[PDB]
Every structure is written in C-alpha cells, then in structure tokens.
C-alpha cells in the first residue's frame, strides 16, 4: 500500500544535477557553488557528502554507469528484439539520456575528453563505463552469429560512432550527424 | 646568410598552450601553466594574448591553417585515389594526434567544452570542422558522389575519427584507430 513519499534527498539531487552540469559544460567547468545555487542548499551540505570534487566525480560516473547498465539489461532481455534492434534502441536510450535532454553530451564522452586531467580514481571510473558498453555491444552482435572478433571491432565502430556524432551534433543542432550513427548501423548489421 | 630558425615567444606560446588544451582541455590549462613550460613571464603571454579567450582563438585559427595547408597538399597530389586521399587524410590526423604523445583532436577537444566556451572561440571550432567536412565532401564529389550522400559520409568519417581518438588515447587501444580505417576502406568505392 503506501510508500515513503518520493522526495529526493539531499545527495541524490546532488548527484543527478553535477551529472548534468557535467554533460553540459565538463567537469573542469563546474564547481560546488553551481550546485549549491542550482538547488538551493549550501555549499557546506555538498563538501559534507563529498568532501573533494573528486569524491563526487566518482559517484556521478558509478551513478550513471550502473543506470545505462540497468537500461542496457532491458533491451538485451527483450526477447521480441531481434540483435539489429537492440542496437538500434541501446541508440535510442543514449539520444534520451544526451542529446535529447537539453543537448547533452554523453557522460562517458566528456570524462574521456578531460581524462589526462583527471584524478586517476576518475579515470578509472570512465575506463569502466566504456568497457560496459562495449561487452553489451559485443554480446549482442555474438547473438547475430558475428564472430569475436568482428564482434569487438563492430562494438568498438559503433562506440566511437556514437560519441563522434553526439559530439558534433550539439554544436550545431544538426541532426544529421545522428542520423549518420543509425544509417551506420542499419546499413552494417544484419 | 638568412636570419636564424629561432621560434619568437608568440610562436613558442602558441605552440605549448595546442599542445596543453589538446593533452588536458581549453579549461585544464592557464597561462602560469605556459610560463611554467617555457619559462617567461605571465605578463609576456599576456603582451601577445590579453585575455585566455584571445589565446583560445590564435591557437584554433592557426591549428586550422595547419590543418589547410595539409589538405591542399593531399588534394594537389594526383597520385592518390578519391579513397586514398581520405586514408592519407586520417594519417594527418594521426600524426597530430595519437601520434604525439596520445594526443587528442584541438578540435574535438574544444567541442567536448563548447557550451563552456566564449562564442568567440565556438565559431572558430565550428569553422575548424566546417573546412574538414567541405573537405572530405569535396574528396568523395570526386568519386562520383552526390551532394547529400558526400555531406552524409563526410560527416560520418569525421564523426568516427572523432570518437575513434577519443577512446584510443584512454588506454592505448589501436584497435578504435584500426575501426576508423576499416571504414573507409570499406564504406568508399
Ligand atoms: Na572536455
């Protein structure tokens, strides 16, 4: 019957606008005090979960990595889709959580722009995004009866394809350079 | 007896501040960080460049020049293939790049930071790619390509070397590099 009310806490909404403001501008261009202005609490209440800006770089990309995860999971267990389709919906989840949401870039993207200037903690974290999405990518393509290693490359094409074109989409608003990343997979896989 | 090959402080600071926002990003470096590598004075930077806007516009205009002079030499060549000309052009790319010290794009980079940016220095990476993809467009027109699908393949060939230099440089994979080229070979005629 009835639950706690829904009431984000004072983490979680810290967590989901430094992921935003990340996919906006990077990490190198946000501080506490945008946080704190965006939401209105004070700048002592984000040091106190996350005492340095890495603590909280961390927990955003683990954050988002285990959602896309959770997405990623529901597409594959799909059974009505075939491989071709679940690729072109793991697309069309990225689009949702990027460029469709006031013209973000991907998450993954820009902690891998601005990874020489990481902490290593960070880096780390972003390595672990990337190859998610690659085993995923693999996975379903080994399902299409590719071979490993064609499997790999497809999964490593499709990736850079993606990220390449959000890049260069938001710039513009130039649809086209999406549109590019579905002609490639419509045209490529089985 | 002509005049000796020593790069003058403008030069050498345009070349240290391309190869710092190209390792780290446009907001990863300053200028103490370029008076550090070289040795001068802030106020010398400053001298050339008042603002770090002024320098983030020298550098893309005169990487673009590079980038230019590199594609006219491509194109003049008439040795190469449609196809070749876009092989030698991601070899370019290579070079300035991955190549050196794992680089990645100065334009990619400063896209990544777009929103982040002066619009001073936005136009300037929006021209920086614009020259890339008129470039490639005009490769592939000819091949015997028309206007939409040049534009189209243009755009993904840029699109891929983008996103291929963004992951090699994570953790050495060659393999995103060895994708980008497997396209091209593969996808042009
Ligand atoms: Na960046």
Redesign the pocket.
């Given at each position: 019957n009835a639950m706690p009310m829904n009431i984000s806490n004072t983490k979680e909404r810290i967590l989901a606008v430094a992921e935003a403001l990340i996919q906006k501008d990077?990490y190198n261009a946000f501080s506490f005090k945008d946080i704190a202005t965006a939401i209105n609490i004070k700048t002592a209440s984000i040091h106190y979960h996350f005492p340095s800006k890495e603590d909280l770089g961390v927990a955003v990309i683990s954050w988002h990595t285990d959602k896309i995860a959770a997405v990623l999971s529901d597409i594959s267990n799909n059974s009505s889709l075939s491989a071709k389709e679940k690729i072109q919906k793991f697309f069309d989840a990225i689009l949702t959580l990027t460029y469709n949401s006031e013209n973000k870039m991907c998450l993954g993207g820009?902690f891998a722009?601005?990874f020489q200037s990481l902490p290593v903690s960070i880096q780390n974290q972003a390595k672990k995004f990337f190859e998610l999405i690659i085993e995923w990518l693999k996975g379903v393509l080994e399902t299409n009866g590719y071979d490993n290693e064609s499997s790999l490359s497809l999964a490593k094409q499709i990736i850079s394809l993606v990220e390449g074109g959000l890049l260069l989409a938001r710039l513009y608003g130039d649809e086209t350079f999406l549109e590019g990343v579905r002609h490639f997979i419509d045209q490529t896989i089985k």
């Open positions: 990077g820009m722009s601005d």
